[PDB]
């Protein structure tokens, strides 16, 4: 599924992203953006040789099972395929744990390199929220 700029929004602050971790929804909305595009079929293999799954680019290294990620860790407990759902709420439970383990939104390199510091609520003007 190829979410709608708005549509994206209205379904993570449904989900309870915005103000999580005190992260204003434009900052989860941006990070979507530059990460998958709104798609939530979005995959993309890293160096490392782990792989980043979904509208927020879960990566295979730390957070899901995908069955070719050596000495990696599964800590949202899932297949790194069930983060490519149409239905966006395992990927966002997952990046609750994920922005919740001391890095803040630093763990995704697209929000640090493209959202960091811009006027990120630029990403949900126009939507109704
Ligand atoms: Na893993
Ligand atoms: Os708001």
Redesign the pocket.
């Known amino acids: 599924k190829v979410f709608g700029r708005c549509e994206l929004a209205a379904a993570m602050?449904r989900h309870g992203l915005?103000?999580y971790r005190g992260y204003?929804?434009?900052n989860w909305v941006c990070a979507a953006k530059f990460e998958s595009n709104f798609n939530t079929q979005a995959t993309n293999r890293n160096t490392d040789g782990s792989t980043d799954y979904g509208i927020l680019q879960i990566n295979s290294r730390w957070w899901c099972n995908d069955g070719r990620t050596p000495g990696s860790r599964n800590l949202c407990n899932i297949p790194c395929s069930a983060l490519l759902s149409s239905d966006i709420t395992a990927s966002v439970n997952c990046a609750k744990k994920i922005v919740s383990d001391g890095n803040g939104m630093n763990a995704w390199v697209a929000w640090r390199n493209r959202c960091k510091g811009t006027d990120v609520?630029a990403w949900?003007r126009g939507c109704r929220?």
Do not use: F
């Open positions: 602050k915005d103000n204003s929804l434009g609520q949900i929220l």
